[PDB]
């Protein structure tokens, strides 16, 4: 379960690599880029990026073999979340990834993000029977949507 991350010019690399029983090693590589909007509080944007990385690591860890098969066209990534920089409030994150072959992967989770420290994964689970937008009204929060396209390739 080796991981590695690189960043340059607001572009990032995320890698997951595992040894095979065949005596060979193959790694999964993805890359994507993000923008920082000067009129939007950087503290929330910082948390969003870190959350994106954490959620992608979890998906890659669970479905490594499927992603080995998917050496090909860039995957579409969609994230919808309610994220605040306040330790007294739980954040909710939902991640969806769409394959070129039509396969869809989904995750959801909850996080706590202290403004000065790496985000903490929590034991609590997202409620699948309730629309997130409803939750945003009940506990006031801006709904944040973002999309990435990432290049999934495997080592040859």
């Amino acid at each position, epitope marked *: 379960k080796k991981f590695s991350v690189e960043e340059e010019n607001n572009k990032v690399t995320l890698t997951l690599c595992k040894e095979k029983t065949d005596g060979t090693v193959t790694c999964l590589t993805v890359e994507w880029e993000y923008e920082v909007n000067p009129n939007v509080d950087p503290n929330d944007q910082k948390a969003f990026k870190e959350i994106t990385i954490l959620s992608l690591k979890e998906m890659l860890g669970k479905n490594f073999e499927e992603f080995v098969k998917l050496n090909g066209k860039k995957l579409k990534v969609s994230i919808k979340a309610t994220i605040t920089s306040n330790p007294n409030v739980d954040n909710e994150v939902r991640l969806k990834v769409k394959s070129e072959d039509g396969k*869809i992967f*989904e995750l959801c989770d909850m996080y706590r993000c202290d403004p000065d420290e790496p985000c903490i994964k929590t034991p609590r689970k997202c*409620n*699948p*029977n*309730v629309d997130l937008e409803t939750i945003a009204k009940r506990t006031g929060s801006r709904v944040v949507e973002e999309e990435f396209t990432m290049n999934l390739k495997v080592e040859k």
Partner: antibody
Amino acid sequence: QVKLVESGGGVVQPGRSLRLSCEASGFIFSTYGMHWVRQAPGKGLEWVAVIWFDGSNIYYADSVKGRFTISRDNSKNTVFMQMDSLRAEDTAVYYCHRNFYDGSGPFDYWGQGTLVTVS
Amino acid sequence: DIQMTQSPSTLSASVGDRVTITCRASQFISRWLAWYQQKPGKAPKLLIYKASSLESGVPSRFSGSGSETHFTLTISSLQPDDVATYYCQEYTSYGRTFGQGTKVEI
């Protein structure tokens, strides 16, 4: 209007199998999921199984796990449950159930149910 | 493995006020709890969502509830037509769990 209609059931022998189904109408099953809820006579309600729209999120009650299977007809708003290896205490009315809170407009629908007995 | 328990399955009562039902969770379930009403001849109807709010068409005789691990239902006056089986339901995740339920009788 929105309807859930059960089909199948009736008297079967111990062991073997029967197929139950839920036919939806008045809405498109494109989101969330569908549930089966059991009403044994002399007893309260208990949950049996769920199928989420994607068809990948499948869960079973522990009491029936490794028994029965859930599937969906891709061409129709219909959900199937196959029962097998039936035994005493599987006797119940089986209800089709759907629930989605949708903010100010919550949904909760139940069908008439169908009776399954073992003899 | 969320499990639910119930206040006594039978509540004999007069037509008067303050008939109560309680429900407990084995685990923290926040406020994601609902209550149902049933007559022997038909499928149950939803009365309460988030253990706090009325469904449309529900009579004003109503109650709110507790939180996290403990919940209540109260009837401010018992009508002869409110005689029913009542159930406690949990919905924090995929699938659902039901309590044994209770009965209220005149």
